[PDB]
């Protein structure tokens, strides 16, 4: 219990697309973060962190849910 950083070290403002997303990850404020962070597995073969503060993020992410649900 000394110093803990949020899971999303940073976010990236580039408007991404749902075509590349296969796995979604959402972590609510934890003992390391006092807020909320959206995380996503990139098809490239790594992880990526989105900022719910951007409208395009709520969209590409919304489509993923509507796509994984309709599937």
């Amino acid at each position: 219990a000394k110093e803990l950083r949020c899971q999303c070290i940073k976010t990236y403002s580039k408007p991404f697309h749902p075509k590349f997303i296969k796995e979604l990850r959402v972590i609510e404020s934890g003992p390391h973060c006092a807020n909320t962070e959206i995380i996503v597995k990139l098809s490239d073969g790594r992880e990526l962190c989105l900022d719910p503060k951007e409208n395009w993020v709520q969209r590409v992410v919304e489509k993923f849910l509507k796509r994984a649900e309709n599937s």
Binding site: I9, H17, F20, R25, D44, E47
Partner: peptide
């Protein structure tokens, strides 16, 4: 050869 009408990272310091 399907086109990717976009894009993904052009930097890398995002590994939770």
């Amino acid at each position: 050869m399907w086109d990717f009408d976009d894009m993904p990272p052009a930097d890398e310091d995002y590994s939770p």
